[PDB]
Design an enzyme around this catalytic site. Structure first.
Site, PDB file in Angstrom:
ATOM      1  N   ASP A  25       0.806  -1.211   0.000  1.00  0.00           N
ATOM      2  CA  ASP A  25       0.000   0.000   0.000  1.00  0.00           C
ATOM      3  C   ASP A  25       0.852   1.282   0.000  1.00  0.00           C
ATOM      4  O   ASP A  25       1.265   1.786   1.057  1.00  0.00           O
ATOM      5  CB  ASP A  25      -0.942  -0.021   1.214  1.00  0.00           C
ATOM      6  CG  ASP A  25      -2.011   1.085   1.161  1.00  0.00           C
ATOM      7  OD1 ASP A  25      -2.900   1.087   2.026  1.00  0.00           O
ATOM      8  OD2 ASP A  25      -1.978   1.925   0.247  1.00  0.00           O
ATOM      9  N   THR A  26       1.079   1.828  -1.196  1.00  0.00           N
ATOM     10  CA  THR A  26       1.902   3.027  -1.345  1.00  0.00           C
ATOM     11  C   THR A  26       1.260   4.272  -0.749  1.00  0.00           C
ATOM     12  O   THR A  26       1.971   5.218  -0.428  1.00  0.00           O
ATOM     13  CB  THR A  26       2.278   3.305  -2.824  1.00  0.00           C
ATOM     14  OG1 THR A  26       1.090   3.533  -3.600  1.00  0.00           O
ATOM     15  CG2 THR A  26       3.079   2.135  -3.405  1.00  0.00           C
ATOM     16  N   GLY A  27      -0.063   4.261  -0.569  1.00  0.00           N
ATOM     17  CA  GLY A  27      -0.771   5.395   0.046  1.00  0.00           C
ATOM     18  C   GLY A  27      -0.892   5.326   1.563  1.00  0.00           C
ATOM     19  O   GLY A  27      -1.521   6.190   2.178  1.00  0.00           O
TER      20      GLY A  27
HETATM   21  C1  MU0 Z   1      -8.959   5.249  -0.623  1.00  0.00           C
HETATM   22  C2  MU0 Z   1     -10.180   4.343  -0.761  1.00  0.00           C
HETATM   23  C3  MU0 Z   1     -10.798   4.412  -2.148  1.00  0.00           C
HETATM   24  C4  MU0 Z   1      -9.779   2.900  -0.434  1.00  0.00           C
HETATM   25  C5  MU0 Z   1      -9.133   2.822   0.928  1.00  0.00           C
HETATM   26  O1  MU0 Z   1      -9.682   3.310   1.907  1.00  0.00           O
HETATM   27  N1  MU0 Z   1      -7.982   2.139   0.939  1.00  0.00           N
HETATM   28  C6  MU0 Z   1      -7.234   1.815   2.144  1.00  0.00           C
HETATM   29  C7  MU0 Z   1      -7.305   0.319   2.431  1.00  0.00           C
HETATM   30  C8  MU0 Z   1      -8.710  -0.164   2.659  1.00  0.00           C
HETATM   31  C9  MU0 Z   1      -9.264  -0.040   3.915  1.00  0.00           C
HETATM   32  C10 MU0 Z   1     -10.550  -0.502   4.151  1.00  0.00           C
HETATM   33  C11 MU0 Z   1     -11.285  -1.076   3.126  1.00  0.00           C
HETATM   34  C12 MU0 Z   1     -10.725  -1.205   1.864  1.00  0.00           C
HETATM   35  C13 MU0 Z   1      -9.432  -0.755   1.628  1.00  0.00           C
HETATM   36  C14 MU0 Z   1      -5.750   2.121   1.983  1.00  0.00           C
HETATM   37  C15 MU0 Z   1      -5.429   3.496   1.401  1.00  0.00           C
HETATM   38  O2  MU0 Z   1      -4.063   3.433   0.966  1.00  0.00           O
HETATM   39  C16 MU0 Z   1      -5.622   4.652   2.387  1.00  0.00           C
HETATM   40  C17 MU0 Z   1      -5.345   5.976   1.674  1.00  0.00           C
HETATM   41  C18 MU0 Z   1      -5.627   7.143   2.579  1.00  0.00           C
HETATM   42  C19 MU0 Z   1      -4.573   7.903   3.104  1.00  0.00           C
HETATM   43  C20 MU0 Z   1      -4.838   8.984   3.944  1.00  0.00           C
HETATM   44  C21 MU0 Z   1      -6.154   9.300   4.256  1.00  0.00           C
HETATM   45  C22 MU0 Z   1      -7.199   8.539   3.727  1.00  0.00           C
HETATM   46  C23 MU0 Z   1      -6.941   7.465   2.897  1.00  0.00           C
HETATM   47  N2  MU0 Z   1      -4.770   4.492   3.567  1.00  0.00           N
HETATM   48  C24 MU0 Z   1      -5.292   4.345   4.793  1.00  0.00           C
HETATM   49  O3  MU0 Z   1      -6.509   4.419   5.000  1.00  0.00           O
HETATM   50  C25 MU0 Z   1      -4.377   4.032   5.971  1.00  0.00           C
HETATM   51  C26 MU0 Z   1      -4.366   5.163   7.008  1.00  0.00           C
HETATM   52  N3  MU0 Z   1      -2.972   5.141   7.429  1.00  0.00           N
HETATM   53  C27 MU0 Z   1      -2.433   5.988   8.417  1.00  0.00           C
HETATM   54  C28 MU0 Z   1      -2.718   7.346   8.396  1.00  0.00           C
HETATM   55  C29 MU0 Z   1      -2.177   8.193   9.355  1.00  0.00           C
HETATM   56  C30 MU0 Z   1      -1.349   7.685  10.344  1.00  0.00           C
HETATM   57  C31 MU0 Z   1      -1.061   6.328  10.367  1.00  0.00           C
HETATM   58  C32 MU0 Z   1      -1.595   5.479   9.404  1.00  0.00           C
HETATM   59  C33 MU0 Z   1      -2.203   4.375   6.674  1.00  0.00           C
HETATM   60  O4  MU0 Z   1      -1.005   4.199   6.819  1.00  0.00           O
HETATM   61  O5  MU0 Z   1      -2.998   3.766   5.634  1.00  0.00           O
HETATM   62  N4  MU0 Z   1     -10.923   1.965  -0.557  1.00  0.00           N
HETATM   63  C34 MU0 Z   1     -12.067   2.219   0.322  1.00  0.00           C
HETATM   64  C35 MU0 Z   1     -13.288   1.785  -0.475  1.00  0.00           C
HETATM   65  C36 MU0 Z   1     -13.127   0.312  -0.832  1.00  0.00           C
HETATM   66  N5  MU0 Z   1     -11.866   0.104  -1.521  1.00  0.00           N
HETATM   67  C37 MU0 Z   1     -10.816   0.917  -1.386  1.00  0.00           C
HETATM   68  O6  MU0 Z   1      -9.773   0.687  -1.988  1.00  0.00           O
END
Ligand code: MU0
Lengths: 99, 99
Positions: A25-27
């Site tokens: 997870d690069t994000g």
């Molecule tokens: C971005 C959406 C579209 C995605 C999603 O939530 N993916 C997450 C992983 C995830 C989590 C829960 C469900 C599904 C995927 C992983 C992402 O990389 C997501 C991107 C992001 C970043 C910042 C703020 C908000 C969102 N990352 C995150 O949510 C976390 C939060 N986090 C963190 C933040 C601060 C301090 C310490 C840790 C971290 O390291 O990754 N998503 C939700 C809908 C369904 N599919 C999907 O891909």
């Protein structure tokens, strides 16, 4: 290896006696794993995702094996739906984005 | 380009003639941008991740130029904490993970 993004980049990780599937997870700044009762000291923390915050436990210097590559670092444990391998560990195993 | 992960993989995107910074996010299925105006009909949608669910507006066939690479695809708009380029557009620009 090279991983395409047609599907979620899920891989097998090992932490102690537990094998789990986790997103490369690069994000993600940090590695966030589903609930597990790891040994040693930890600190409480709040981390913010797409829909708000969750409460996690931060454990430091945890060895994790990702596709046979050794890593060691901070792991945040809490009620995440998906195990997330964040940048803190992705750099340790040599991971880059390329296009 | 090759992008390392010691920093957030933030890049400049061009959308509707506007320049924005967005996160190249292999952990995102979808591309989600902070509140903005886009033309065309949108569909109400809900997405859920860490911290819960939010309501977004789905716009289809929107061109974004990501780091000079052209994509045309689905863009969600809503209260995301950060502009996110997800796998639907990462695949279009030939993005892979390598280690
Ligand atoms: C971005 C959406 C579209 C995605 C999603 O939530 N993916 C997450 C992983 C995830 C989590 C829960 C469900 C599904 C995927 C992983 C992402 O990389 C997501 C991107 C992001 C970043 C910042 C703020 C908000 C969102 N990352 C995150 O949510 C976390 C939060 N986090 C963190 C933040 C601060 C301090 C310490 C840790 C971290 O390291 O990754 N998503 C939700 C809908 C369904 N599919 C999907 O891909």
């Amino acid at each position: 290896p090279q991983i395409t993004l047609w599907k979620r980049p899920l891989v097998t990780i090992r932490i102690g006696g537990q094998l789990k599937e986790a997103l490369l997870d690069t994000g993600a700044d940090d590695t966030v794993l589903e609930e597990m009762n790891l040994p040693g000291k930890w600190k409480p923390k709040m981390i913010g995702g797409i829909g708000g915050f969750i409460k996690v436990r931060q454990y430091d210097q945890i060895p994790i094996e990702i596709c046979g590559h050794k890593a060691i670092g901070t792991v945040l444990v809490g009620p995440t739906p998906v195990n997330i391998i964040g940048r803190n560990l992705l750099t340790q195993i040599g991971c880059t984005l390329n296009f």
